[PDB]
């Protein structure tokens, strides 16, 4: 079993994290925040046309290995 590689497309760049498809949005955006040097509150994930909240899990939206989430970062001071 390989670990699930989730690509995150941001205004800044494009990254890819490794999660055991158990990491929901509340766990996943923490991995984003430390890497992009952003606050988790400044991170809003979007997929299927709707915003992924902490009640949302990436895996439930069909975001598995090779899929990409659309992130919008609102730090301003991290361009």
Swiss-Prot record:
Subcellular localization: Cytoplasm; Nucleus; Endoplasmic reticulum; Cytoplasmic vesicle, Autophagosome
Other comments on record: May be a prognostic marker for lung adenocarcinoma patient clinical outcome.
Expressed in which tissues: Brain (at protein level). Ubiquitous. Highly expressed throughout the brain; detected in neurons and in neuropathological lesions, such as neurofibrillary tangles and Lewy bodies. Highly expressed in heart, placenta, pancreas, lung, liver, skeletal muscle and kidney.
Assembly mode: Monomer and homodimer. Heterodimer with UBQLN2. Binds CD47, NBL1, GABRA1, GABRA2, GABRA3, GABRA6, GABRB1, GABRB2 and GABRB3. Binds UBE3A, BTRC, P4HB and MTOR. Interacts with the proteasome 19S subunit. Interacts (via ubiquitin-like domain) with TREX1; the interaction is direct and may control TREX1 subcellular location. Forms a complex with UBXN4 and VCP. Interacts (via UBA domain) with UBQLN4 (via ubiquitin-like domain). Found in a complex with UBQLN2 and MAP1LC3A/B/C. The monomeric form interacts with PSEN2. The monomeric form interacts with PSEN1. Interacts with ORAI1.
Residues in Ubiquitin-like domain copies: 4-78
Function of the molecule: Plays an important role in the regulation of different protein degradation mechanisms and pathways including ubiquitin-proteasome system (UPS), autophagy and endoplasmic reticulum-associated protein degradation (ERAD) pathway. Mediates the proteasomal targeting of misfolded or accumulated proteins for degradation by binding (via UBA domain) to their polyubiquitin chains and by interacting (via ubiquitin-like domain) with the subunits of the proteasome.
This protein's domain notes: The UBA domain mediates binding to PSEN1 and PSEN2. It also binds ubiquitin with micromolar affinity, independently of polyubiquitin linkage type. Essential for its association with microtubule-associated protein 1 light chain 3 (MAP1LC3).
Residue window of the full protein shown: 34 to 112 of 589
Entry PTM: Degraded during both macroautophagy and during chaperone-mediated autophagy (CMA).
Protein known as: Ubiquilin-1
Top-rank taxon, per record: Eukaryota
Species of origin: Homo sapiens (Human)
